[PDB]
Structures are given as structure tokens and as C-alpha cells.
Amino acid sequence: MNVTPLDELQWKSPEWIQVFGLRTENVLDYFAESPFFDKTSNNQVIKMQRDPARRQILFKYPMYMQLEEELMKLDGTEYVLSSVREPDFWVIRKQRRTNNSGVGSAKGPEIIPLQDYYIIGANIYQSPTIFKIVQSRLMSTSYHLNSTLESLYDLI
Amino acid sequence: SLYPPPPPYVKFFTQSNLEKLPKYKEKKAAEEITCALDYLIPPPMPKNQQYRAFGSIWESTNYQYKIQELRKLLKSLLLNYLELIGVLSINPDMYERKVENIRTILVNIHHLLNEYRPHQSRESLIMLLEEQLEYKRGEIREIEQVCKQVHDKLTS
Amino acid sequence: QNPLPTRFEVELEFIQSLANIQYVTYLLTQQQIWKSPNFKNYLKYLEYWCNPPYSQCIVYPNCLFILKLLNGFMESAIVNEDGLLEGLDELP
């Protein structure tokens, strides 16, 4: 039993036939990543059953913009001049590729932050990573290799 | 590497095919290889018990015709269109029958060209073989030249 | 000369080659074939030889034992990113 854990591959060619070309892309990701767990899909199934500061920075163009309204509706803790979301998954993109996050937004007149996971998506692959996790990486690697070097100082 | 690679059949053993297997096995119950999934099912045991271990070691589909039709349907399609347009005379309680005929015409035509690929494929093979046979012939006649130029170059 | 082998013949020949420890090694320490689950899945499919009437065709009995080992190992074997089988990295 071996895990792929801290993001690895895609799901590829299988919704390449179903076709990836933005907007549909997000749903293709859902099958692929094995990472739609609650809200976005839940919204999907219920129907299937029968701005923000970052959003202002983002600005949504086409049908995914319509979905966005739906998602807010699904997940909005409400305060006087503010709304906060539970488990929505969403995206930011360009041309060949994009990046998407699954997040929680806290709002106010002069500031608003979404805490989430962010995932980049190029050519049927997802990236989800952490600095500090990122460092431990080639850092411990550098040192194990330096200690190979130090072990080689077994020279007279 | 005198060590062989694993059998070509390995490519069929994807996790997607494995998932489709249980349903396929069922449907089947309702050498004969027809699709990829057939390879995920052990081959049948031969009749000749000589595979038992001795011990241990520890009608021509006439196309000249199909082209006739094709040529007909085409004129028929053209006339029928000539009428819809008004170039030829026709009473309005037919107008839609013309449209009927065109749809049906264009269909049959499709089925024809459709049934013409085999014969088409062959002309392509016979076109390839011809082509490569001409290439190889050339390759030799090219080697021949060199031997003749070496004779010239040798005699000056 | 004989015609090209049948699938049944190809698989019988192949499962039996696993009776050779060196060869199984040369595979275990391949790269490409462990990237994708295909080969792993193939070897589990090959356990069809372990039962009758199939097994009655096996001349090299060790290959069945080694297949079994090889198989059980794989389930819990951790596959490196390149293809390297993790639990073997120390050995040649």
C-alpha cells in the first residue's frame, strides 16, 4: 500500500475525451485530483440529485462567474457588511494553464482574506505545496549528501 | 539485454480497464480477441494435453457498383436541390418532400463512401509498398553509383 | 520452424522465466515498469497459473512461489517517484 500523498500526478486523457478548455476544466479537476470532498461537489450533487477583495482582484469571465454566485449562496456566514464561506473550491487562470483554491473568506470594508488550499493546474496535473515543507526538502537532501561528503573524508 | 521485456499485453492492464472488468465479465457470460479487456482474462487451456508438464525442474462486395450508386445519388441529390431552389418546377405540397429526399440522399451517400474504406485502405497499402519498394531500389542504385564513381576516381 | 507463440504460450513461457532469480532481479531494479501499475497488475493477473488446470502445465514450480512472494511484496512495496522500488534501494 503506497500513497501518492503531497500532490503527484493527474487524471489524464479520460476527460481529455470529455474535453478540457477552462470552465469544464474545474469539473475535470474534480475527478482527477480526488480532492472535491464537500461543498463544490455537494452543490453539484444536489442539483444532480433529482465582490470579495480577492474576487475583485480576480474578476470572473463566463459561466463559472454564474456558478460563483451559486457557491456564495451555498456557503455564506453573514455579518453586517461581510460574508464568509465554508468549503468552496475555485480558480485563477491564463491561456495554456490556471491555478485554483478551495477556501474560506473573511470580509471587511478595507480588507478581505480567504484561507483555503490553493492548487495550480497545467496539462492534467495538480500542484498543492508548502514552504517550510518546501525547504525541508532539498535542505535535508543537501545535508545527507554533505554527510556522504564528510564520510568520504575517510582519507588519511 | 538478452533478458526479454514483459509481454506486450501489459499495456492493457490499466486501473481503468480493471474497473471495467467485472461488468465486462458479466456481459460476456450472456483465439477470439476483440477488445482490450479480453487480455485481462486468462487464455483458455489448449486441447492437446501435451502442455501438461512432464515433470519438475527445481462473395465480392462489388465496388464498381457502389460507385454507380454514388454517382446516381449525386445527380438525384442535385436535381432535388435544383427543385427546392426553384430552378426546376414543383408544387409546394412537395417542397418539404424535396427536403426529405435531400436528407435521405445525403445519408445513403455517407453510408457508401463509408463502405468504401476497405477497398480504399488496400489502394493505400498497395501505394505504400509501391513507394518503399521504389525507395529501396533507389538505395541500391545509389550504392551502385558510388562503386562506379570509385572506378572513375580510380582511373584518371 | 514454428509459427509465433500463442498468448497462452507467451504467458506460460513468461511466468516460468520468473523462476530465474537473476532475471526477477533485473526486473525489480528496472525503472520504467514500476512508474505505472500495469506491470504490477499483470503479475497479479498471472496468478491464474497457480490453480488447475493451469498449474498442471508448470514445469518450473519455483516460479509460482516467486510470483507469490513477488506479488505480496508489491502490495506493501513503496514506489519511489522515478520508478525505483524503495525497499530495495540499498541493494545493487
Binding site: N2, L9, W11, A32, S34, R137 | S16 | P37, V79
Partner: peptide, 25 residues
């Protein structure tokens, strides 16, 4: 001003950091 310029080495031919298991549909 730690040294002067910064020592290139950039590398995609290294051992490897990616695995692979969700290839199957």
C-alpha cells in the same frame, strides 16, 4: 554583498521528486 554573483546550477535531470499512481481512469 555576500560574495558577488549568484552560483547557477539549475537542474531537471536530477534524481526525481514526482511519483505516479493516478494514471488509471
Amino acid at each position: 554583498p555576500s560574495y558577488s554573483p549568484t552560483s547557477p546550477s539549475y537542474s531537471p535531470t536530477s534524481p526525481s521528486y514526482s511519483p505516479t499512481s493516478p494514471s488509471y481512469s
